[PDB]
Amino acid sequence: VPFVEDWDLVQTLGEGEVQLAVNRVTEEAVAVKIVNIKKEICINKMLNHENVVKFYGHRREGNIQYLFLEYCSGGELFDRIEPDIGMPEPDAQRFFHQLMAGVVYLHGIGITHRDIKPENLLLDERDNLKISDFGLATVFRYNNRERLLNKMCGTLPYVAPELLKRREFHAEPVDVWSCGIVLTAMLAGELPWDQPSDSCQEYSDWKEKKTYLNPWKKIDSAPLALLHKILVENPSARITIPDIKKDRWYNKPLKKGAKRPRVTS
Numbered sequence: 001v002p003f004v005e006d007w008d009l010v011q012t013l014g015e016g017e018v019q020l021a022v023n024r025v026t027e028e029a030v031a032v033k034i035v036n037i038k039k040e041i042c043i044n045k046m047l048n049h050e051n052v053v054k055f056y057g058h059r060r061e062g063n064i065q066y067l068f069l070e071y072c073s074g075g076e077l078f079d080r081i082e083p084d085i086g087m088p089e090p091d092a093q094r095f096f097h098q099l100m101a102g103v104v105y106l107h108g109i110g111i112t113h114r115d116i117k118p119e120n121l122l123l124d125e126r127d128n129l130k131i132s133d134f135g136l137a138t139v140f141r142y143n144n145r146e147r148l149l150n151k152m153c154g155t156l157p158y159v160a161p162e163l164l165k166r167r168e169f170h171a172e173p174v175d176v177w178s179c180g181i182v183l184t185a186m187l188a189g190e191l192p193w194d195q196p197s198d199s200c201q202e203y204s205d206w207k208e209k210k211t212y213l214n215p216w217k218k219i220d221s222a223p224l225a226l227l228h229k230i231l232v233e234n235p236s237a238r239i240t241i242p243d244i245k246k247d248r249w250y251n252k253p254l255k256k257g258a259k260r261p262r263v264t265s
């Protein structure tokens with residue numbers, strides 16, 4: 001079929017730069033990342049899951065790398081969070097379920113994302129969450145042997161406290177912590193602290209269980225009981241994903257399915 005390989009760059013999606021590309025023949029939309037990168041391509045080739053941004057391929061034009069990735073028309077989860085309000089609790093529970101499925105998948109194949117935040121969680125046309133950007137990602141389990149991490153990666157308001165206090169740490173509780181900060185942002189529309197350190201007053205208040213303060217006072221007791229188990233300073237005592245899936249709020253019926261068309265009489 002002629003011209004089937006031609007794509008037109010129609011608009012900017014993010015910033016390296018991310019462009020929306022449309023196929024000249026089929027009109028299929030893809031996101032093109034125009035660029036660490038060698039590792040991002042290698043990790044992306046391992047990935048295949050409904051809550052993980054799809055990798056279609058790559059092309060190297062001299063010094064420039066072109067990553068052909070899934071287009072998510074709903075944009076970033078970040079723009080679904082109303083500042084200081086958040087979003088309706090049933091929406092946050094659905095986004096959190098899909099975030100857990102995506103992270104379970106990644107950890108299962110021994111990959112840690114290391115930069116989970118709402119800017120990296122994209123939504124398709126049906127508002128299905130997709131974990132995006134594997135530029136900071138790494139392999140923490142190979143040949144069934146766990147590798148402890150030591151590199152400083154992520155975004156300070158979402159990083160686990162052990163990444164700041166310890167030389168080495170396990171990879172999985174770090175992604176669990178950032179998911180908990182994402183859950184906090186979705187339910188309160190604010191970040192609880194700048195960084196999880198003792199020098200940070202907001203972080204000390206949380207360890208002192210002052211939940212009458214913002215953002216915790218905006219969060220219902222059931223999802224807050226979950227946050228009490230995720231945002232635990234000691235990563236060895238922090239709730240694992242199998243146990244998040246057994247939490248009372250995680251399994252609380254709150255939301256109806258996608259609106260489906262119907263007529264009466």
Ligand SMILES: N#Cc1cnc(NC(=O)Nc2ccc3cc(C(=O)O)ccc3c2)cn1
Nearest residue numbers: 013018031053069070071072073075132133
């Ligand atoms: N790395 C990476 C990466 C970045 N973007 C990917 N896909 C994608 O569709 N990106 C975006 C990013 C921002 C967007 C923002 C909007 C919007 O603000 O309306 C709509 C669609 C968007 C789509 C896929 N992988």
